[PDB]
Design a protein around this ligand. Structure first.
Ligand SMILES: CCOc1ccc2nc(S(N)(=O)=O)sc2c1
Ligand SMILES: [Cl-]
Ligand SMILES: [Zn+2]
Length: 258
C-alpha cells in the first residue's frame, strides 16, 4: 500500500496511518472572502528570491519538486504574519484532470485549475527536519493558477517534465528563478494550518495570494502527462493530486487588504 490520491488510498483514507488528518488545524481550507477580516497588525510581506539557487527537479510520485539550496540565507520569505526568517526549500504544484479543479485551497468554494506551493522553513530551528516539530516551523506561499495566457516563467519547468515522467526520476535544474511565477499583487489571506499531504503536520503558517497567475492550456496539459507510477509500471497519469478543503474549526482567516 501507500497513501496516494486513488479510490483506495486517497485523502479519505489518510487518517488511518496519519490520525492528525482529522486534527484541529488541517489544510487546505475554503477561503470565505466575506468572513475573512482585514488585519492591520500584519506587516508588509517580503519575498526576496533574487539570490535563489535551484538545484534539481524531482518526481516523487505525488507531484514534482523544484528543490533549492537552503544551506545559506538566500531565497527568503518574511514580514506579513511571520516572525523571523523563513527559507525557501522547494516548490511544487497540485493540479486537476480538468481545468475546473486542481487547487487545494478554494475561494468562496471556487476551485482553480492548479495551485503552486513555495515551501519555506523557519531559520531559527536550524533546518527543515527540526522545523516540522514546531507550531510555527513552516510557511507556505500558495498561488492559484487559472488557464488563460501562458506564464513565460513557467516554461522552463514544463519543458523538463519529459525527463522526470515517472516516480523516482530527477534531473538537474539549476538557475531557475521563482520570481517568474509570482503575480503582480502580493495581497493575501493567512491562517494557521498544516502540510496538505502526509505526514500532514500542523506546523504551517499559510499565506495564500489573492491574485492568481495565468498559465496556458498547453502548459497545464503537460503537467497532466506526468505519472504517479514508476518506470515500467502501468501508466497512472499524475492528475488530481489535491486534497479537498478541511474543517476550519477554531480558526480565523485574516486578509492583508481592504
Ligand atoms: C517531510 C516530508 O516533506 C514534506 C511532506 C509533506 C509536505 N506537504 C507540503 S504542502 N502541500 O506544501 O503542504 S510541503 C511538504 C513537505
Ligand atoms: Cl486511479
Ligand atoms: Zn503542496
Amino acid at each position: 500500500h501507500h497513501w496516494g490520491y486513488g479510490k483506495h488510498n486517497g485523502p479519505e483514507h489518510w487518517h488511518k496511518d496519519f490520525p492528525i488528518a482529522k486534527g484541529e488545524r488541517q489544510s487546505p481550507v475554503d477561503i470565505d472572502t466575506h468572513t475573512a477580516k482585514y488585519d492591520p497588525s500584519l506587516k508588509p510581506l517580503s519575498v526576496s528570491y533574487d539570490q535563489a539557487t535551484s538545484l534539481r527537479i524531482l518526481n516523487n510520485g505525488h507531484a514534482f519538486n523544484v528543490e533549492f539550496d537552503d544551506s545559506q540565507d538566500k531565497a527568503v520569505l518574511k514580514g506579513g504574519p511571520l516572525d523571523g526568517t523563513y527559507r525557501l526549500i522547494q516548490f511544487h504544484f497540485h493540479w486537476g484532470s480538468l481545468d475546473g479543479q486542481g487547487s487545494e485551497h478554494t475561494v468562496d468554494k471556487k476551485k482553480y485549475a492548479a495551485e503552486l506551493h513555495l515551501v519555506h522553513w523557519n531559520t531559527k530551528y536550524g533546518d527543515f527536519g527540526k522545523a516540522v516539530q514546531q507550531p510555527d516551523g513552516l510557511a507556505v506561499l500558495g498561488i492559484f493558477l487559472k488557464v488563460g495566457s501562458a506564464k513565460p516563467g513557467l516554461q522552463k519547468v514544463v519543458d523538463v517534465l519529459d525527463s522526470i515522467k515517472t516516480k523516482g526520476k530527477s534531473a538537474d535544474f539549476t538557475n531557475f528563478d521563482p520570481r517568474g511565477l509570482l503575480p503582480e499583487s502580493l495581497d493575501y489571506w493567512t491562517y494557521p494550518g498544516s502540510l496538505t499531504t502526509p505526514p500532514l503536520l500542523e506546523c504551517v503558517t499559510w499565506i495564500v495570494l489573492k491574485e492568481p497567475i495565468s498559465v496556458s492550456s498547453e502548459q497545464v496539459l503537460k503537467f497532466r502527462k506526468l505519472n504517479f507510477n514508476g518506470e515500467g509500471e502501468p501508466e497512472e497519469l499524475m492528475v488530481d493530486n489535491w486534497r479537498p478543503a478541511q474543517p476550519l474549526k477554531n480558526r480565523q482567516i485574516k486578509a492583508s487588504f481592504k
